[PDB]
Amino acid sequence: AVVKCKPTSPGRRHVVKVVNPELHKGKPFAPLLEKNSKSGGRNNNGRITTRHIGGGHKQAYRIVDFKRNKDGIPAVVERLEYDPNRSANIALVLYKDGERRYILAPKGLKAGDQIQSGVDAAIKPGNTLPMRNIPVGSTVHNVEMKPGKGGQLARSAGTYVQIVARDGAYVTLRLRSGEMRKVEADCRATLGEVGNAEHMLRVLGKAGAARWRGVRPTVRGTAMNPVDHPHGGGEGRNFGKHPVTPWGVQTKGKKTRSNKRTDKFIVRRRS
Amino acid sequence: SLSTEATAKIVSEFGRDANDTGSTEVQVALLTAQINHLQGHFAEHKKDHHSRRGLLRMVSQRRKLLDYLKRKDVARYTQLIERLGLRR
Amino acid sequence: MRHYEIVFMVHPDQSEQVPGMIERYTAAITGAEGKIHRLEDWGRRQLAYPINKLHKAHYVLMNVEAPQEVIDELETTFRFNDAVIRSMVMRTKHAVTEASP
Amino acid sequence: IKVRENEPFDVALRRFKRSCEKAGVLAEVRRREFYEKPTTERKRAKASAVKRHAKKLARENARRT
Amino acid sequence: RKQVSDGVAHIHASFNNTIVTITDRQGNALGWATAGGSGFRGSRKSTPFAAQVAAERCADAVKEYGIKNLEVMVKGPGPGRESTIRALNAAGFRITNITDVTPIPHNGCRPPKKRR
Amino acid sequence: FCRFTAEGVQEIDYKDIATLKNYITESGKIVPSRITGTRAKYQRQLARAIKRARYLSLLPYTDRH
RNA sequence: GCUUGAGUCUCGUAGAGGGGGGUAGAAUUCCAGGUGUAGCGGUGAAAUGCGUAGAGAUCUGGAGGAAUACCGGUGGCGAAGGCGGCCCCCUGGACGAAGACUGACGCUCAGGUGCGAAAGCGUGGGGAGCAAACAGGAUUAGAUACCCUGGUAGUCCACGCCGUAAACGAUGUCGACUUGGAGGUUGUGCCCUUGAGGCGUGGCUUCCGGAGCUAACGCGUUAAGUCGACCGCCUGGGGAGUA
RNA sequence: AGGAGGUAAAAAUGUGAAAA
């Protein structure tokens, strides 16, 4: 799990990486690998719309199906795999019919466990089923917001959601952000919680460690020139202004929540 | 805590007979089986110190038996420890 | 095998299905070679206090002697069965008989 | 903890309240647990408790009464 | 006004003040009066006598609602808690029953360490 | 000093709530041995029967619900 | 070699002993809505503070973490610290009875090792209530305190560390011997179980006392009495249990 | 005899020489 290397050299001192001996060492399943081309945060116009992105190591897209449409077919997990794109770990499952797909590895999952989807699945980790059959107060992950959408909520490493209420056609879920949001009861969700919860304790250790992950250096606003940022200028590290974005939007307090279309789903906004 | 039938199985293998339940030889093995049984228990939990005191107790007690058996009869000492495999 | 004194309440509406619940667990009992002793369903009985709702409940006694493994599996069902309410289990104490009422 | 006294009451007489806990339990549950004085508070009390029976036993001897 | 027939006189009494509230059987209160609201403040406010006067001020304006018989629900101890009871009966209402409900825990929350 | 299974050796159950009523007040509070006079061994057995009955909603924890 | 030392086995017993996983009620707090409304709250008195926005008060539903009234007792368990809502899973120790088995395998111990209230610290969660520091209002000669209103760390959980207490029955540990009384508590045996009893027997443990002991207070079959074995420690007070 | 309720704001200081 969490291990801290010895300070053999500067930059290797504060290095703490998370090791997992259960992870399959070897080339992944070819039939599920679409190529992925990074852009470094440049759109069709080619301009840097999302700064600080670029470089890194070449990654291949792992086609993981979180839509989970196969119902009633029992499937045993062949093995677990490391995903360069995800934050958690993917698990190569194999359906009885002879079809292999990827899924987010829950906490209680082993290379041999058997999960399935449908309305008659057993209340066990990794099983996906309509929230109208899930017992209130339980914990699930990879939840959809639209029936047959695919699953947007709770899909990060060591993350989950808490199903609380069920008033007829709706279900009140307590998101991990400490917020109560309603959702159609007929949405599917994998029961359990996302594994690899120790990903959080991982400390990069060195500058290059963040660079090859795909993140370019961030320049502080107070260092730029008056034309480059609302901050900066002056002589020596003097601020004098109210913190804002490089474009002039008040930061540290300004609530940018402006949708109104999905407002009647937010039961209790996070605080 | 070992099962009574298991203890009956131990005595029927080490002592002269089943009636030699309190023999030095059986006393060693009986304590050993209990330790191995509790070895898995203490492998986890890491907090049963009160139970662990009981364990460390039967460890020192089993230790005392071997020291006595050695000075008593050098042969049987080595004979018992090989069929039980404890010295290392 | 150890003895147990399983007892739980059932929602009045699900009270009509109590035989089916008993029969299902009886299949579990026979599926564990458990020496079932009682089956004294005290019936639709009023509670001492309303449990979130329902003034009246449906008590049922099993008191079955069974293997360790099956008793573990059995209790999980109760926690995931919406009909059953307040399902506790007790220890051996030398398998018993006749009812109190 | 309830009284009705249907028709012929004309008076409270709800002493059942004070017969159980009414305010005696609230008079002490109001503050300071400490878990230390409660022990010594009764040890000092039960000290005299046993001594209260000890006093009554060694009386018969004088005073001309 | 609706002219209700039975109301509940919730009397939440404390060691310092006493609130008198004649509600409805449904719980929807129709009027209230306090010991402090009846003049007496501070020390004189925390007296059994002050509790009695508060009963009458609350007993009034309920006849407007026509409460003939009523239930009495007392909560917590205090200087009054029993003086205002008869004062409420002397008002001219039928005391159906007096249910004393108090927040007596089973050793739940932590109590303060005040009063030194 | 009250009579019990001291001589008529038997076992305490929890289902016999009628007898359990004989050891509790109106508010359903466990009556101490200082009043019952029963032995401490059976008193604990009695207390366990009460808590089991309270959990199974046979004997109320408190009066009002 | 033997057996009265220690220990093993078989058979029962009481228990907040230790650890893990669930779960129930009361209460407090918050949130949403309805009725309804000028005070609420606090104290020795008062004020800060909340409140015509519309609180407190009262009712319905829901969300939460922590702590478990009565039981509960100078009761029991544990080496000590310390452990009490209930159920289940794994597990330690002690005690009693009848015989058998091993045959002094015993006691203790510097170094060493394990455990070890609370506070405190490291990483990550949790946060109702209580509440160091802190703010304000009172009290006061002043109040940097006691009182009151709020309130952070922390108290809680998982995993490590620290190893200190008036850690105290202030009494080291093991064994034996030396009149009783009232008790509590848990096993075992006999008698007419005729009836909550009559005649006993061990352990644990509470108070009062004879001998003897002590400076006295008091101790007193669990001795600070009478002997034996080993161990730790003391050599006037402050300095200091610091450098 | 047995168990419960009620009971105090302020109240600082006093230096240095005497016993048959």
UniProtKB/Swiss-Prot annotation, chain A:
Q: Which UniProt keywords apply?
A: Acetylation, Ribonucleoprotein, Ribosomal protein, RNA-binding, rRNA-binding
Q: Which Gene3D superfamilies match?
A: 2.30.30.30, Nucleic acid-binding proteins (2.40.50.140), Ribosomal protein L2, domain 3 (4.10.950.10)
The domain of life for this entry's organism is: Bacteria
Q: Which GO terms describe its molecular function?
A: RNA binding; rRNA binding; structural constituent of ribosome; transferase activity; zinc ion binding
Comp. bias intervals (Low complexity): 38-47
Q: Which one GO biological process term can you cite for this protein?
A: ribosomal large subunit assembly
Which protein family is named in the record?
Belongs to the universal ribosomal protein uL2 family.
Q: What does this protein do?
A: One of the primary rRNA binding proteins. Located near the base of the L1 stalk, it is probably also mobile. Required for association of the 30S and 50S subunits to form the 70S ribosome, for tRNA binding and peptide bond formation. It has been suggested to have peptidyltransferase activity; this is highly controversial.
Q: What is this protein called?
A: Large ribosomal subunit protein uL2
To which species is this protein native? Answer: Escherichia coli (strain K12)
UniProtKB/Swiss-Prot annotation, chain B:
Which SMART domains did the record assign? Answer: Ribosomal_S15
Entries under InterPro entries matching the protein: Ribosomal_uS15 (IPR000589), Ribosomal_uS15_bac-type (IPR005290), uS15_NS1_RNA-bd_sf (IPR009068)
Which PROSITE patterns is this protein grouped with? RIBOSOMAL_S15
Might you name a Gene Ontology BP term for this protein?
cytoplasmic translation
Q: Name one GO cellular component term.
A: cytosol
Pfam hit, one: Ribosomal_S15
Entry keyword Ribonucleoprotein = yes
Q: What induces it?
A: Part of the metY operon that extends to pnp, also has its own promoter.
- Keyword hit for Phosphoprotein: no
Name the keywords, alphabetized.
Ribonucleoprotein, Ribosomal protein, RNA-binding, rRNA-binding, Translation regulation
Extract the GO molecular function terms from the UniProt entry: rRNA binding; small ribosomal subunit rRNA binding; structural constituent of ribosome
Superkingdom, natural source? Bacteria
Listed under subunit, the entry gives:
Part of the 30S ribosomal subunit. Forms a bridge to the 50S subunit in the 70S ribosome, contacting the 23S rRNA.
Job of this protein: One of the primary rRNA binding proteins, it binds directly to 16S rRNA where it helps nucleate assembly of the platform of the 30S subunit by binding and bridging several RNA helices of the 16S rRNA. Binds to its own mRNA, stabilizing it 5-UTR and preventing its translation. In the E.coli 70S ribosome it has been modeled to contact the 23S rRNA of the 50S subunit forming part of bridge B4. In the two 3.5 A resolved ribosome structures there are minor differences between side-chain conformations.
The text of the family note is: Belongs to the universal ribosomal protein uS15 family.
The identity of this protein, by name, is Small ribosomal subunit protein uS15
Which species expresses this protein natively? Escherichia coli (strain K12)
**Highest classification ranks of the organism:** Bacteria, Pseudomonadati, Pseudomonadota, Gammaproteobacteria, Enterobacterales
Swiss-Prot record, chain C:
- Entire-sequence positions represented here: 1 to 101 of 135
Residue positions of the PTM N6-acetyllysine?
K93
Its BP terms in the Gene Ontology are:
cytoplasmic translation
GO molecular function: any one? structural constituent of ribosome
Which GO cellular component term is one of those annotated?
cytosolic small ribosomal subunit
Its annotated function is as follows: Binds together with bS18 to 16S ribosomal RNA.
Q: What is this protein called?
A: Small ribosomal subunit protein bS6
Query: At the top level of its lineage, which domain of life is listed?
Result: Bacteria
Keyword annotations of the record: Acetylation, Ribonucleoprotein, Ribosomal protein, RNA-binding, rRNA-binding
Q: How does it assemble?
A: Part of the 30S ribosomal subunit. Interacts weakly with uL2 in one of the 3.5 A resolved structures.
Record-stated family = Belongs to the bacterial ribosomal protein bS6 family.
Fill in the PTM field for this protein: 5 different forms of the protein, varying only in the number of C-terminal glutamate residues, were isolated. The sequence shown is form bS6-6, which is the longest. The first two Glu are encoded by the rpsF gene, the other Glu are added post-translationally by the RimK enzyme.
From Swiss-Prot, chain D:
**Pfam families listed in its UniProt record:** Ribosomal_S21
Q: Give the GO molecular function terms.
A: rRNA binding; structural constituent of ribosome
Region Disordered: what ranges?
40-65
GO aspect biological process, one term: ribosomal small subunit assembly
| Segments of skewed composition (Basic residues) | 43-56
Question: Which residues belong to the signal peptide in this entry?
Answer: none
Q: Which GO terms describe its cellular component?
A: cytoplasm; cytosol; cytosolic small ribosomal subunit
Q: Which InterPro entries match?
A: Ribosomal_bS21 (IPR001911), Ribosomal_bS21_CS (IPR018278), Ribosomal_bS21_sf (IPR038380)
Q: Which UniProt keywords apply?
A: Ribonucleoprotein, Ribosomal protein, RNA-binding, rRNA-binding
Q: Where is the composition biased (Basic and acidic residues)?
A: 57-65
Stated role: Probbly involved in recognition of ribosome rescue factor SmrB in stalled/collided disomes; fusion of protein fragments to its N-terminus decreases ribosome rescue in the presence of SmrB.
User: Cross-referenced NCBIfam families, in alphabetical order?
Assistant: S21p
Give the record's subunit note.
Part of the 30S ribosomal subunit. In stalled ribosomes contacts ribosome rescue factor SmrB.
The UniProt family comment states: Belongs to the bacterial ribosomal protein bS21 family.
Q: Indicate what this protein is called per its UniProt record.
A: Small ribosomal subunit protein bS21
Organism, scientific name: Escherichia coli (strain K12)
| Gene (UniProt) | rpsU
